């Protein structure tokens, strides 16, 4: 039948999760942002559409830091992005508090990964 795309955790007959795919549409509709890995670091950059002359220049920052060594940038629904960084920050604080050392990027990535994957289970 149909209706497989109305509820979030449902598998369509071809094994897909339509809500996750519709989410992607929201991402593609967003501003473009990138990242470049260099020989000893990484660079992040993003496009900030100037809706009007009324936007105070340089003020509405989009890139966010996590702990003191991680940068995050995203495209799509900005509020969802912040929500994810907030979790990332708690995720990083928790890790440092227990292990003393600031959280490794691979570890941090999976923290974000498991959290997002979790939002496709219900």
């Amino acid at each position: 039948g149909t209706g497989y795309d109305l509820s979030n955790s449902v598998f369509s007959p071809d094994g897909r999760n339509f809500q996750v795919e519709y989410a992607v549409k929201a991402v593609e509709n967003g501003t473009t942002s990138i990242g470049i890995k260099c020989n000893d670091g990484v660079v992040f950059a993003v496009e900030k559409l100037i809706t009007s002359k009324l936007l105070v220049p340089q003020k509405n920052v989009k890139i966010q830091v996590v702990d003191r060594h991680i940068g995050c940038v995203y495209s799509g629904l900005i509020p969802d992005g912040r929500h994810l960084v907030n979790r990332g920050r708690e995720e990083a604080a928790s890790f440092k508090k227990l292990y003393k050392t600031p959280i490794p990027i691979p570890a941090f990535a999976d923290r974000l990964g498991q959290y997002v994957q979790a939002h496709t289970l219900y």
Binding site: V61, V65, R89, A93
Partner: protein, 233 residues
């Protein structure tokens, strides 16, 4: 409710015309055993604040972690973290004060005595004390534990009231404080000869001096003293 185990003794400080000075020896005592000697009890926060801590060391290390987090957290989504929106000494203090009082109110205190020294963004000197009871106060000079009885009287001979602040130079002040550290080494049985000193000047910034030592002590007259009354040799 707990009981301190590894402890740090006195923390002395005072303010002068352009800033504030604060010092503390490098000892972590374990009862009467002078167990640890490389303990830094002066915690700098940014470059306008130094937090001196006495009392239970395990709790001090915990206050340390709290302070590092404050700095991290303040940076988040703050494009002015190193400018107009950086941590002021008064912010650091009010935070700690808040925690100390909440902890005593839950009958589980952070067994310490803290002195927050620093310079506010508008140049003002900041010197305030907070302890395990959550009690707080300010004075031109402030000392914890033993230094409250022996350091304060000396330091107060330099800056007796507010009006003496502008008349006190960094030299005079650092001298008073260095002498006080010697006196404490003379009469405090839980003190070390090594210590750290820090200056927070509205012009020269934060100067943190490590590995100082009490010097120029008087012990020679000890040879002339024998017996405890009638003994002659």
């Amino acid at each position: 409710t707990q009981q301190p185990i590894v402890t740090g003794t006195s923390v002395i400080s005072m303010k002068y015309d352009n800033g504030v000075i604060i010092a503390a020896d490098n000892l972590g005592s374990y009862g009467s055993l002078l167990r640890f000697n490389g303990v830094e009890r002066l915690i700098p926060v940014g470059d306008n604040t130094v937090v001196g801590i006495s009392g239970d060391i395990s709790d001090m290390q915990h206050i340390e972690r709290l302070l590092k987090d404050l700095v991290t957290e303040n940076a988040y989504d703050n494009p002015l973290a190193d400018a107009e929106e950086a941590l002021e000494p008064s912010y650091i203090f009010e935070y700690l004060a808040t925690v100390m009082y909440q902890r005593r109110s839950k009958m589980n205190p952070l067994w310490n005595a803290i002195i927050v020294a620093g310079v506010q963004s508008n140049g003002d000197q900041f010197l305030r004390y907070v302890n395990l009871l959550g009690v707080t106060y300010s004075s031109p000079t402030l000392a914890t534990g033993f230094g409250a009885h022996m350091a304060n009287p000396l330091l107060r001979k330099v800056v007796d009231r507010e009006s003496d602040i502008p008349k006190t130079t960094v030299q005079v002040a650092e001298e008073a404080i260095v002498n006080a550290m010697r006196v404490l080494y003379y009469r405090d049985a839980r003190s070390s000869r090594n210590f750290s000193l820090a200056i927070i000047d509205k012009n020269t910034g934060l100067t943190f001096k490590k590995n100082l030592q009490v010097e120029n002590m008087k012990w020679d007259f000890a040879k002339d003293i024998k017996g405890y009354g009638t003994q002659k040799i």
